Design a binder for this molecule. Structure first.
Ligand SMILES: O=C(O)[C@H]1O[C@H](O[C@@H]2[C@H](O)[C@@H](O)[C@@H](O[C@@H]3[C@H](O)[C@@H](O)[C@@H](O[C@@H]4[C@H](O)[C@@H](O)[C@@H](O[C@@H]5[C@H](O)[C@@H](O)[C@H](O)O[C@@H]5C(=O)O)O[C@@H]4C(=O)O)O[C@@H]3C(=O)O)O[C@@H]2C(=O)O)[C@H](O)[C@@H](O)[C@H]1O
Length: 542
């Protein structure tokens, strides 16, 4: 029984991931990772060998949504209460005077000492990339502290409000500037700036300001949310409609001397590595490569489709921008013969099977850029876009992904010649989410019946030792796993209470810094993502 499984799972998290380091006076905070076999919590190793237990609240915002949803569907308020208590504790102890939290890519809390940590000593800064925190919960606990965070986030990460120069990181302890009252002057596409306007952090700026508007009716927040979203639309290629991952280019401060030194101070990294053969259109924002296209055509799309709907009449432009881009990506990059996307430049250039002729930001010389399989995160974004605009081009991508993923044939159109694979072994929570989206818009029973099968596969093959794991051999389970989130969304659908579970935007957290190896050496740019990929007996490789 799915709801019973999720309740048992969250009970297990609150037992095994809890603060066991302060006797009978524990904090409410949780460890990000737990070995489900032993209960060992995942640790970060600092240069002197001190071990901290990783508690990064930005990497727990799927769990927070799971706990809220579990309380809604079960009627047991203890999970909502604990999620609220964790939020309250972070505002009480881990929010600096500027409003920023000790979370994100380069800050976390040590569950043993309850001190904020900074694992990247050259980077003791605030960083959110495709995080999408559960601000709805935070506002219900403390609306002023949540608003202070969102304003402080923009205050630290907007380097120049006149031109909307943004940055993926921000400093703590900054005084508040003019914020939404700042004067703005729109600049031409790909103006040169120091700050890096990557859309993974831009996603979090747009989303947070939109939630501040939703909760506090802050019209300045909404104006700048829409303006920042527009910054990623204005530079899109005039002919293809593709792009963009960023809307500025790196300000060239020094002449480069080595291809393999990719510091942004030497200028746009794509223009260095691709400029000689491809010309001026080779800019970082225009590189439609694996990963970048997930941030653009999945994470940004999920958030903007939901925001566009929420805004009603004044969200129509946002919906058009978002769907137009997904159409362009399908038209140029999708290969329906083998369910791949072509690596591309946004001017329409195909980079399939291109061999890199020099070292650079996008790979060593000799690297071959290959078409890459379209994963289930794109099944979600194409399903949701089709619900808004019933375009057969969008359906073709959804149908190709589902077929490639072993789900069968979702039909030539919703409900037309459906032949789904009810014996599928697929256990991907992303596929479950996408099938619920196809079902919600079409009301075709077979899509939810297939979603039930995926849910049963998730329980059968990923519910292991009381936790959810991507493989039975993984060393650590992630308490932010989205398997239980998909299961709750399925239960909410079956119970005719879809609003019981927060909309899935595919956010996640990460932690990055130097990590100490057993020989005492420093492994720079280590990520907790890497720790969660280890199997039993495996260690991080240099
Ligand atoms: O595998 C993937 O594709 C990867 O894609 C995303 O991540 C990419 C990239 O892979 C990440 O490494 C990261 O890169 C950022 C910059 O592009 C990179 O050059 C590096 O930048 C550092 C500093 O972070 C940056 O602030 C600049 O710093 C200046 C100076 O060098 C520094 O010493 C000084 O203190 O501050 C200066 C300044 O403020 O300008 O430039 C530095 C440099 O070396 O150039 O690191 C950046 C970073 O950590 O954000 O993010 C990329 C991204 O697209 O976000 C994806 O997020 C990954 O998950 C993965 O998929």
């Amino acid at each position: 029984d799915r709801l019973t499984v999720v309740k048992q799972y969250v009970d297990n998290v609150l037992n095994k991931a809890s603060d066991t380091y302060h006797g009978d006076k524990p904090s409410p905070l949780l460890a990000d990772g737990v070995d489900p076999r032993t209960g060992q919590q995942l640790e970060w190793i600092f240069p002197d060998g001190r071990r901290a237990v990783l508690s990064n609240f930005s990497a727990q915002q799927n769990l927070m949504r799971v706990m809220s949803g579990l309380s809604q569907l079960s009627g047991d308020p203890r999970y909502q209460k604990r999620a609220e208590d964790i939020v309250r504790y972070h505002f009480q102890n881990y929010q600096d005077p500027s409003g920023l939290l000790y979370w994100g890519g380069h800050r976390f809390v040590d569950l043993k000492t309850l001190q904020p940590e900074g694992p990247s000593e050259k980077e003791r800064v605030h960083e959110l990339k495709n995080a999408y925190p559960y601000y709805d919960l935070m506002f219900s606990v403390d609306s002023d502290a949540t608003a202070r965070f969102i304003r402080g986030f923009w205050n630290a990460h907007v380097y120049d409000w006149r031109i909307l120069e943004t940055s993926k990181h921000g400093e703590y302890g900054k005084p508040m500037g003019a914020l939404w009252e700042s004067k703005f002057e729109q600049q031409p596409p790909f103006f040169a700036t120091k700050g890096l306007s990557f859309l993974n952090a831009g996603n979090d700026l747009i989303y947070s300001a939109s939630l501040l508007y939703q909760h506090q009716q802050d019209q300045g927040a909404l104006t700048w949310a829409k303006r920042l979203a527009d910054q990623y639309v204005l530079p899109r290629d005039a002919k293809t409609g593709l792009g963009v991952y960023q809307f500025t280019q790196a300000l060239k401060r020094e002449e480069p001397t080595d291809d393999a030194d990719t510091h942004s101070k030497f200028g746009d990294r794509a223009q260095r590595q691709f400029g000689p053969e491809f010309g001026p259109a080779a800019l970082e924002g225009n590189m439609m490569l694996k990963g970048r296209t997930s941030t653009l055509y999945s994470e940004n799309a999920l958030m903007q489709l939901q925001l566009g709907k929420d805004l009603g009449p004044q969200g129509q432009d946002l919906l058009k921008w978002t769907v137009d881009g997904l159409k362009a990506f399908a038209k140029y990059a999708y290969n329906d013969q083998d369910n791949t996307f072509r690596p591309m430049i946004a001017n329409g250039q195909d980079l399939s099977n291109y061999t890199l002729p020099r070292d650079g930001y996008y790979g060593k010389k000799g690297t071959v850029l290959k078409p890459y399989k379209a994963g289930n995160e794109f099944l979600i974004s194409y399903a949701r876009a089709y619900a808004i605009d019933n375009d057969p081009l969008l359906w073709k991508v959804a149908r190709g992904i589902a077929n490639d993923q072993g789900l069968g044939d979702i039909g030539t159109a919703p409900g037309k010649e459906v032949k789904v694979n009810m014996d599928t072994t697929n256990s991907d929570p992303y596929a479950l989410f996408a099938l619920l989206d196809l079902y919600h818009a079409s009301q075709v029973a077979d899509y939810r019946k297939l979603a039930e099968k995926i849910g049963d596969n998730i329980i059968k093959t990923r519910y292991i030792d009381g936790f959810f794991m991507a493989s039975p051999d993984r060393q650590y389970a992630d308490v932010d796993a989205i398997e239980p989130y998909a299961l709750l969304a399925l239960e909410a659908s079956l119970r005719n209470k879809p609003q019981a579970v927060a909309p899935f935007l595919n956010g996640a957290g990460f932690t990055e810094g130097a990590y100490r190896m057993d020989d005492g050496s420093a492994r720079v740019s280590t990520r907790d993502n890497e720790l969660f990929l280890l199997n039993v007996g495996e260690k991080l490789q240099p």
